[PDB]
Symmetry: C3
Subunit: 30 residues, 3 copies
């Protein structure tokens, strides 16, 4: 369960960076 957890945190970290990029771009467009 420790590895399971660390991999989900890893995924969340890439997901939030991805969403951050998507929102920043949207703000640029309007």
């Amino acid at each position: 369960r420790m590895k399971q957890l660390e991999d989900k945190v890893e995924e969340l970290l890439s997901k939030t960076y991805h969403l951050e990029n998507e929102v920043a771009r949207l703000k640029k467009l309007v």
Copy 2:
């Protein structure tokens, strides 16, 4: 403490999946 973290990670995953859908909907409305 492990189950508590598992619970928080699951909730943040659910929140991120919801926000991805909201952004998708928005990009579609805005465009390129």
Copy 3:
């Protein structure tokens, strides 16, 4: 290790609330 994960989850919680605020603002400006 458990403390590090906890730290990261705390960080992600804040990031996630920040994004929610930004998305909500965009939803209201676009409609």
